[PDB]
Design a protein around this ligand. Structure first.
Ligand code: YHR
Ligand code: YHR
Lengths: 384, 384
């Protein structure tokens, strides 16, 4: 029993969750194309179903989030984390051994449930173990940076491993890593609820800004590989590599602008980030080769880093100013915003790409971001 | 008689016209203040009249512009140019000796008529003298360079000279320069009309682009000095110097982006420059000292330079692609945009500032520019 073991456990759990989220994007469209028969343009018939597949995790996470907290209060913290590891291992094995469409849907649903359980339980355990105030910050920083590390490491992993070792290599590797995390976890040892926090306009503006900024990436996952295979004629191992700028630029932007944004005002950072997201999504569907998506994706990642570094401190400041705040107050609002974006984006986006073209979806999302960007003016000098 | 005299005549005429347009900015409100009266404040009662006074030039420029063409065809070019000198000299003398509000109105009106006549006749004479189709570009370029140069030394001239020499000095100097231009002038010697060009959407979008880009500076003239004397409490000689960044930044931006815009697309330059304007007009009314306007004014000038350097070649290309083009079709389409901007901006700005607050006007203009910015996506790849 030591304070570092819980940190390493939460680190590995969040890394595994984000890696399993990201790895699926290069793999599902390629597998669905391969099972029927770069050859054919029949993917338009399946776009609504591939889009609805991705939203299952967000929908189940939203459905299961409110019940997690009371369970942790009445039966502790370790058992919900063990449940999360078991569900994650079941999800990864089901992904590895699935052959049809329904099995992948079940895998995504189970992954959503396990992710919600593991996230809430791990945050609770890290809060409970450290009781120094200042120390909690350096622990939460490392644990939350683990998510970005997993996102960076796992984006081109699946696409490269699918065409070389097979369809069951990355999922079994993630299963072994989850088994290691579970084995490590085997050796261990209030105020203003969220629905009141979402009742004031100042928090709602920030949450909507975060959701609309992340919908650029939310609706680019299930629709970009299909677009690449239909038009660009790129090989199957480069589909995951097109998302590397979206992660590297995000990490660079979040570090640099967490350093710099306090000097020139946070609302200006949010406005410029939203505008850059809109312009980047507008310029995305003009590329005729894989090298042409290096620019717009990088700009997109930089603008999302802009918004995510300029909005969280504003949310914390508002919660401290007008309500009573706890350690995880900002986390619940951020998670609700992310899940709402990931659950509303793909489900409507698939319908839009069947009804009309893929570029019109990008133009619509960019225009929505640009129109919403002026509304960040409200956040400056928030009244008590 | 030669070909380098007409160039200097058109140069001096455009230079003096722009100086007389710009030097009235910090003289009218200060004259009203020191004729009606730290300082008791009532300028909110007269802001509407001050705003309406500035629109007369644009209004009867638009009213008189259609009639100058057939007159030039029937009776030549030199006589309408000499009439411009006579009307401009009358306007500057009237500005020098005016004491009441009606005289300033009629002087501005005369300046509008003289500016329209001088501009049309001068461009006609420059086109008539040169008939090489290569040196004509340099001939227009020098005159428009003088047009740009006037607005640099026009704004921080009246404000500085007013508090040190008096109210009758700069107008008399401009009158002497006008008489010199007339003395120089004394020793001298068709397709797709405009109303059909304003019928296709691809030109109307560009015209609205230029107009809504210049409305930010159009509504900033009559209302910024009054705001400065009401809040910032600056001396009377610093009102004119607050517009120098909007001139220098505009010149720098127009040079750089005329060099650079073709590499990254003209529509993207316009889209980026219509958002810098919206942010600049939003950060303008937050300053609490004179030194806080150096940033937003420079940004506004840079964005206007971006738009004006990325839109004119688009208009020329569109007119060549879909219609029949002449020497100054882009000139006419730009004039109809500038005059509409200067005629619609100040009046409604005065009404808004007397109805709601001054900062709300800049917020509305910035929101309008941001909303209209996505519509520049249409201008890429226009069909034939
Ligand atoms: C699945 O990806 C995630 O799930 C994370 C990211 C979401 C999004 C994203 N997805 C991609 C998928 C790709 O595959 C092809 C490629 C690129 C991207 C990008 C690029 C852009 N990107 C940003 C990532 C943001 C992460 O969230 C946090 O960093 C965070 C930080 C906090 O501390 C301040 C929080 O506390 C308040 C917090 O509360 C919930 C969350 C978020 O959840 C952990
Ligand atoms: C009165 O100001 C004008 O009247 C000129 C400018 C309008 C606007 C402006 N006003 C100010 C007043 C101030 O006092 C306090 C301070 C700052 C500014 C700024 C800063 C920003 N600025 C830009 C200036 C632009 C000029 O117009 C052209 O340069 C032009 C070029 C062309 O060549 C391509 C044309 O041909 C197609 C053309 O056709 C009609 C016009 C325009 O008309 C001549």
């Amino acid at each position: 029993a030591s304070r570092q073991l819980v940190l390493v456990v939460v680190f590995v759990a969040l890394l595994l969750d984000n890696m399993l989220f990201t790895v699926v994007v290069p793999i599902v469209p390629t597998f669905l194309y391969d099972m029927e028969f770069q050859g054919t343009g029949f993917l338009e018939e399946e776009i609504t179903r591939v889009g609805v597949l991705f939203a299952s995790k967000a929908v189940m996470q939203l459905l299961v989030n409110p019940f997690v907290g009371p369970l942790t209060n009445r039966i502790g913290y370790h058992i919900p984390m063990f449940a999360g590891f078991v569900i994650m291992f079941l999800s990864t094995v089901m992904f590895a051994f699935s052959g049809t469409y329904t099995l992948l849907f079940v895998a995504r649903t189970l992954q959503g449930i396990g992710s919600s359980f593991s996230s809430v339980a791990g945050l609770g355990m890290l809060a409970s173990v450290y009781t120094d105030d200042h120390e909690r910050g350096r622990a939460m920083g490392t644990a939350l940076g683990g998510l970005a590390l997993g996102l960076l490491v796992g984006a081109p992993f699946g696409s490269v491993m699918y065409e070389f070792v097979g369809k069951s290599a990355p999922f079994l590797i993630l299963a072994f890593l989850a088994l290691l995390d579970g084995a490590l976890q085997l050796c261990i040892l209030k105020g203003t609820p969220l629905f009141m926090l979402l009742k004031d306009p100042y928090i709602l503006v920030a949450a909507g800004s975060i959701c609309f900024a992340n919908m650029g990436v939310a609706i680019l996952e299930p629709t970009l590989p299909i677009w690449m295979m239909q038009t660009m004629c790129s090989p199957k191992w480069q589909l995951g590599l097109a998302f590397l700028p979206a992660s590297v630029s995000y990490l660079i932007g979040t570090n640099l602008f967490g350093v710099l944004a306090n000097k020139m005002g946070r609302w200006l950072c949010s406005l410029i980030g939203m505008l850059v997201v809109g312009t980047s999504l507008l310029c995305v569907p003009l590329a005729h080769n894989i090298f042409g998506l290096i620019g717009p994706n990088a700009g997109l990642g930089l603008a999302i880093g802009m918004v995510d570094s300029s909005m969280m401190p504003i949310m914390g400041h508002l919660v401290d100013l007008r309500h009573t705040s706890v350690y995880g107050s900002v986390y619940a609002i951020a998670d609700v915003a992310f899940c709402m974006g990931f659950a509303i984006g793909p489900s409507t986006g698939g319908a839009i790409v069947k009804a009309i073209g893929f570029p019109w979806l990008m133009v619509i999302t960019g225009v929505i971001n640009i129109v919403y960007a002026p509304l960040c003016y409200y956040l400056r000098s928030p009244p008590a």
